[PDB]
Amino acid sequence: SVYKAALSAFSQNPRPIRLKVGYAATPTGGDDAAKKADFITSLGAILNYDQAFYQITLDAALRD
Amino acid sequence: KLPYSRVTNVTLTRTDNFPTRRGFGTQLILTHTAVSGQVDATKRTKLYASLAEVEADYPANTSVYKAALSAFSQNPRPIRLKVGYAATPTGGDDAAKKADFITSLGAILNYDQAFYQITLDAALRDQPYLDGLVEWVEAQPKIAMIDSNAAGHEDPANTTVIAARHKGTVERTAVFYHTDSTEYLAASMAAYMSTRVFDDANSAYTLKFKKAPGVRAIDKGSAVVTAITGFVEQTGQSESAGHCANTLIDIGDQEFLVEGSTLTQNVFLDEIHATDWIIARTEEEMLSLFLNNDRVPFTDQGMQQLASVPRAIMQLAARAGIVALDLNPLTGAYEPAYTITVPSVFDIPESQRKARIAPAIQVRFRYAGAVHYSVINYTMTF
Amino acid sequence: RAGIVALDLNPLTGAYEPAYTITVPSVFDIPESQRKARIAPAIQVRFRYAGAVHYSVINYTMTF
Amino acid sequence: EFLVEGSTLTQNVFLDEIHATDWIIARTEEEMLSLFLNNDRVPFTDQGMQQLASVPRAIMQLAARAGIVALDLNPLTGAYEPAYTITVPSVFDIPESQRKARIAPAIQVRFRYAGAVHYSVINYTMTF
Amino acid sequence: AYMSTRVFDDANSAYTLKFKKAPGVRAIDKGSAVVTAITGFVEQTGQSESAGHCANTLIDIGDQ
Amino acid sequence: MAMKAYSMLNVTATLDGRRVIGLMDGDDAITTSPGVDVGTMLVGADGSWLFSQTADKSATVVIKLKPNSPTHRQLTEKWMAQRAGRLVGFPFDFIDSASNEGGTGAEFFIQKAPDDSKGNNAVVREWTIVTGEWTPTIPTLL
Amino acid sequence: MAMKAYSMLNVTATLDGRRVIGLMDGDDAITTSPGVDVGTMLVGADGSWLFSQTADKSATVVIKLKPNSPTHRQLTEKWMAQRAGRLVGFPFDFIDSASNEGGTGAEFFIQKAPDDSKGNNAVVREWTIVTGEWTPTIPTLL
Amino acid sequence: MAMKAYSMLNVTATLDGRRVIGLMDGDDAITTSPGVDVGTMLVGADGSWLFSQTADKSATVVIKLKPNSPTHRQLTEKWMAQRAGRLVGFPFDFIDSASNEGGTGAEFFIQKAPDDSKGNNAVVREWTIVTGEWTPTIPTLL
Amino acid sequence: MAMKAYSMLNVTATLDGRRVIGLMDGDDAITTSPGVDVGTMLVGADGSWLFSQTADKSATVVIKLKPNSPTHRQLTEKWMAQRAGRLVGFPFDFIDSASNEGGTGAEFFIQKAPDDSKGNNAVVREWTIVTGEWTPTIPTLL
Amino acid sequence: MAMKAYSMLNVTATLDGRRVIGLMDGDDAITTSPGVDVGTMLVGADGSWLFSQTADKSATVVIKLKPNSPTHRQLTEKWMAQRAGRLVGFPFDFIDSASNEGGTGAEFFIQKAPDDSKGNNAVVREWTIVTGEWTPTIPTLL
């Protein structure tokens, strides 16, 4: 998830700075993965700590 | 941290908003369809603010929305459109008689008298009872206009048509003829008619004869635009050789209104609008005069005090461009444009002095013309 | 002058309305019995608070 | 090897059009914040209303330089038409009841998106 | 410290807000939707007395 | 919305956020002049003509202030900031509420400085600022 | 048709269709001046002479307007149109009805722009326009 | 500490230790002007712009004195000292106590000299001094 | 499609794909001159004559840029690329939209380099480029 | 990091460790010019062409100093050191902080010497230095 994507992220010819790492869907989607109600609540609990990011990229998991 | 919205609020939408542009009068759209949540026989007239606030009427009904969309589409926008409820009965129990329609109209003024223009659409088109409205809008300080969708106007010989049976006899209505599916009265009336301010200098739109609508297309024909609009090519406008109406023709790629919204042979719409503005201004100023001063005595002293209102409204109107410029057209010699005559109360007996109703003040005008046609000769000598 | 009192304009209409008025009772009628206390009647003053701004709204309609 | 289709989101909504508008919004918010903190107070009149309007009237000017706003020409005709207009409500009429909330009315701004090019056509008619 | 050091006899010296002011030396608190229970402030419409307690917290939005 | 009488009580000017208050007496207290002429007509020896249009959209503004005005303090701080080495824009914009006539700029710079005259009475302090772009606003209410 | 007294109520000026209304006070509100001198006399060291006539038939016009005049709005729109890149003629023509004195041009161009001075009272706004050809009309009524 | 009315009785000027007393009548008795313009805007043929800021922080001061003033004696001694060959700074500094507006310099030099006019009444004597650096003081009391 | 007035806002120049933006002030910012004379007339001692026409279709172009212009960065990169050893064409072409006057070339080369002058204000940077072929375009709109 | 206005207060020059301070007035106080032309185009009698690129990467720099400047002392010591017989490089390098435009060299040598003019006022002292290699730095901030 992190390194195999952050390596590409920090690889542009001009480089960005201060990449942000998340913790949102630490629960495996939910107790019942068929319902997304746990995922929305997981997202709702990550803004309150910090609202500085602008782009959301999920990778190596949560695919489709 | 915390979002920036705690101190501000910035949106980003995709719509079309137009300037406020206050005006003179507001129009009324009366039909049979009712929403029963706001208009059910308790509020026969309802106000609005913009197309967004239009929720009660269906966003695809033919009468209200398909005309209000055109009405709110002028490059400067009018405000506070009024929606009616008048002919909620389907004309009448016996549609052959208009007696129910006149009574329906008589029951909508009492709720509210604020509108100035009457536009009926998507229904009541060329219906026989509709003639009652023509009878009712006279002896009344309003303007009502009917946009027929199709008729035998193209033949200048028939008489069964609206503008044919009534032709030069009515002075307060006009027919915005077009083809079907075009709501046209709303496009110009109360969209361009309303958004004019007469108190400013040179703001007299005497023509209304060369004006573009919001969004609408042209009709077709070259010698058939003489049967309609009853306009002679060069000499003038003949009432016998056509029906006086409007069609929004185009000459270049430029599509514009034509014939200047006449009502009779040579009675143009702006001449009615300006006089109605003068009347409705003098009434308001007279009202604002009994309420400020305590009392107006019943003598010449108080008589000139009442005369002071027209003597200022005429002065404020000649600046706009409605009154002629103190020159007799016959000779170009001197002649006053407007004169105000005040009766002398010195002789009026006590018997009629106890009514507390003043005698009548008289005012004289001189209409200021316009131009609708030009002639050039171009004589070449070589 | 400081900016505590409103600027002589009625917010309802923007028409004229005095910002502050001072009313003084007339001593011409006060009897001798209450004139011997050496305590003056009451003067009344009218304000008009001058507002401020804590929040802003912008719309930003884009036509393309 | 290069990216293709320009990162669309719907039929013809490209990513940069979203990014630029988000930048404009996040810039106006910061500038508005930096305005209550410098001056002590912003009065509730037209005088203070134009003072708040001063921020978008500068951000739009700074953005048209970048190349996000169209260049004051109506594409339909090539005639004159303003690229951006800022409308400010008049506080002169707002009653005291809603004047006590200390929340200003809304300012409106009009854009004109500046296009780009993704495709080209040439004809090459040869006469010999 | 800021309330005292204001002179009202001068022109335009009316600090009606007291709503955007920095302290001498102190740090911020934390929370995004919890600064509504405290300070009882509605996000957009206004300030509701029922939906919070009216107080002050010295929040930060930028680094400010 | 009648075109009311002109008055200095409806003209608003903003210089880097804060307002401008202390202005000297006179019919000209804030004057903006364009950089160069809009164009130039060239007529040849035969009678033909050709007009040339410039790309210089720049302007200068002159502000006259009393010796005791908070704007004077702000400007004399900005001047010292520039002298130290810092260089920034400080946008300035002014407008008339009666006819929406005026203009705005995004990045200005102090170009001139006043002369400190003491004498027996108060004297003007004139500041001259220069922009690289200047956008006037079209007077929509005539 | 007697040669009546002069009056500003009989002078008509047209700028791209619409009239000119708001004009400042003074004995000179619309002034047109030719481009260059009509000719030049050259006298040699012997006493002979030779006159030379120019082919430059061009003129400039100066219009003074109040800060609140619809012509000011029209001109400030035309100026922005030119700045954007569009370039057109907008013919201007003016005449006096008492003596048919005046002139006309076919294609003008904005050459100067006014200075936005606010101050305590109203100030003039002067616009300078330039043509490539200028045809005066002969005063036939003397 | 209200911003009191302006008065010449609160302005203090010091020239090499001693004060300045004898000053002529007028609204301008001590005037300081900067050396050169603060900056210069250059706009190219395409419409771009570039501002240039100078490093010249220098000023000149003009003092007007009566023919009978001890400062005149001090200055006419300093002038002769310079003419003899000695060259020194003699710092000058002046300020207004009502708003802390003014400035100071570290090393000045006599640049001009007055004209000795006798005539029928008293005439001004103007001295012009020049510094290499001039530091204004920021008016903190507005 | 009237022959509008000349303006620098309708002249377009392209240097290896990207545009040219930062140009110095003056009546000559992009100037192209041909290599040699078109021909040569030779008249003998008897009076006969013979004209000779050259096959040298080459040109040079001079571009004047501000010290802060992205084209300056592009050119100073291309110069270092040439100094390293790489040699390529980088076509340059420029035109006026009002009359289709201008020209194009297929392979240019940096021939001169500017002088880095700092001084007190901004100074021009002049680049001189040379082509082996130069095709002008015929002005079809006169 | 906006491209701020140009100013001499952000240009830094270093000559063998120590800075350069005393510079004369003018728009050109430190000027660097390349050795020879970058290339040469040769067009034959048939119309073909061939471009030739030089390997001479050398430059000269001209510095203008006041008669009283520590850099003048340093340079006049270095000149005497060269005259004595010692020969070394003393690298010189200069740059602008606003756009990273400038250059550097590794080993310079004094090539010219100023003329000691006394006269009535101060006069320039011009030094000309020459390098065998000169590497410009690419302006990355445009």
PDB file of C-alpha atoms in Angstrom, chain A residues 11-52:
ATOM      1  CA  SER A  11       9.331  10.066  -8.413  1.00  0.00           C
ATOM      2  CA  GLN A  12       8.179  13.033 -10.512  1.00  0.00           C
ATOM      3  CA  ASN A  13      10.887  15.069 -12.231  1.00  0.00           C
ATOM      4  CA  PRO A  14       9.952  17.990  -9.998  1.00  0.00           C
ATOM      5  CA  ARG A  15       9.109  16.525  -6.686  1.00  0.00           C
ATOM      6  CA  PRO A  16       6.122  17.220  -4.437  1.00  0.00           C
ATOM      7  CA  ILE A  17       6.556  17.569  -0.673  1.00  0.00           C
ATOM      8  CA  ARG A  18       4.862  16.552   2.587  1.00  0.00           C
ATOM      9  CA  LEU A  19       2.984  13.455   1.530  1.00  0.00           C
ATOM     10  CA  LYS A  20       0.171  12.528   3.925  1.00  0.00           C
ATOM     11  CA  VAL A  21      -0.516   8.988   5.145  1.00  0.00           C
ATOM     12  CA  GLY A  22      -3.953   7.901   6.321  1.00  0.00           C
ATOM     13  CA  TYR A  23      -5.486   5.383   8.713  1.00  0.00           C
ATOM     14  CA  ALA A  24      -9.141   5.588   7.684  1.00  0.00           C
ATOM     15  CA  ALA A  25     -10.324   2.094   6.768  1.00  0.00           C
ATOM     16  CA  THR A  26      -8.312   0.327   9.443  1.00  0.00           C
ATOM     17  CA  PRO A  27     -11.403  -1.851  10.001  1.00  0.00           C
ATOM     18  CA  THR A  28     -11.620  -4.309   7.116  1.00  0.00           C
ATOM     19  CA  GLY A  29     -14.425  -2.394   5.440  1.00  0.00           C
ATOM     20  CA  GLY A  30     -16.934  -3.391   8.078  1.00  0.00           C
ATOM     21  CA  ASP A  31     -18.380  -6.145  10.196  1.00  0.00           C
ATOM     22  CA  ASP A  32     -20.665  -6.846   7.224  1.00  0.00           C
ATOM     23  CA  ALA A  33     -18.761  -5.815   4.097  1.00  0.00           C
ATOM     24  CA  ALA A  34     -21.989  -5.874   2.060  1.00  0.00           C
ATOM     25  CA  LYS A  35     -22.941  -2.583   3.739  1.00  0.00           C
ATOM     26  CA  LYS A  36     -20.740   0.490   3.342  1.00  0.00           C
ATOM     27  CA  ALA A  37     -22.198   2.175   6.438  1.00  0.00           C
ATOM     28  CA  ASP A  38     -19.020   1.382   8.371  1.00  0.00           C
ATOM     29  CA  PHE A  39     -16.832   2.881   5.637  1.00  0.00           C
ATOM     30  CA  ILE A  40     -18.631   6.241   5.599  1.00  0.00           C
ATOM     31  CA  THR A  41     -18.354   6.406   9.386  1.00  0.00           C
ATOM     32  CA  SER A  42     -14.656   5.548   9.126  1.00  0.00           C
ATOM     33  CA  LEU A  43     -14.190   8.452   6.720  1.00  0.00           C
ATOM     34  CA  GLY A  44     -16.176  10.788   8.968  1.00  0.00           C
ATOM     35  CA  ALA A  45     -13.725  10.159  11.817  1.00  0.00           C
ATOM     36  CA  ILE A  46     -10.576  11.101   9.873  1.00  0.00           C
ATOM     37  CA  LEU A  47     -11.461  14.682   8.920  1.00  0.00           C
ATOM     38  CA  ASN A  48     -11.722  15.796  12.543  1.00  0.00           C
ATOM     39  CA  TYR A  49      -8.073  14.996  13.259  1.00  0.00           C
ATOM     40  CA  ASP A  50      -6.877  17.052  10.286  1.00  0.00           C
ATOM     41  CA  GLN A  51      -8.356  18.652   7.158  1.00  0.00           C
ATOM     42  CA  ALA A  52      -5.358  19.590   5.023  1.00  0.00           C
TER      43      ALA A  52
END
